[PDB]
């Protein structure tokens, strides 16, 4: 899980077709119950990018892509932001997410 902020956020966007952007801040229950359950996922899929983006630290980022409660994961393709989901979810509900980008 690649540590994201703007110097870097364009080039990681590149590094793999499919990539996920998970929205945090130390403040958030929610987003440190997520946390695990993404580093778990990016080991289980390393053909897709997993990041973390600290809206604490980029509220510019964060506000950039709309994002106004946390935890929000936006999922890209291609460099676009294609689809997201608000709130600590299952991981079942990501990782679906992730095989149909995958086309799986």
């Excluded at 929610?30 to 980029?58: M, R, T, W």
């Excluded at 709130?87 to 995958?102: D, F, Q, S, T, Y």
Aim: hydrophobic share 45%; net charge negative.
């Amino acid at each position: 899980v690649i540590h994201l902020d703007s110097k870097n956020f364009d080039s990681f966007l590149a590094s793999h077709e499919i990539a996920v952007v998970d929205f945090w801040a130390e403040w958030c229950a929610p987003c440190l119950i997520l946390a695990p359950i993404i580093e778990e996922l990016a080991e289980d899929y390393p053909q897709v990018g997993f990041g973390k983006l600290n809206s604490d630290e980029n509220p510019d980022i964060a506000a950039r892509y709309g994002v106004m409660s946390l935890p929000t994961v936006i999922f890209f393709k291609d460099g676009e932001p294609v689809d997201e989901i608000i709130g600590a979810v299952p991981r079942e509900e990501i990782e679906i997410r992730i095989k149909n980008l995958l086309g799986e």
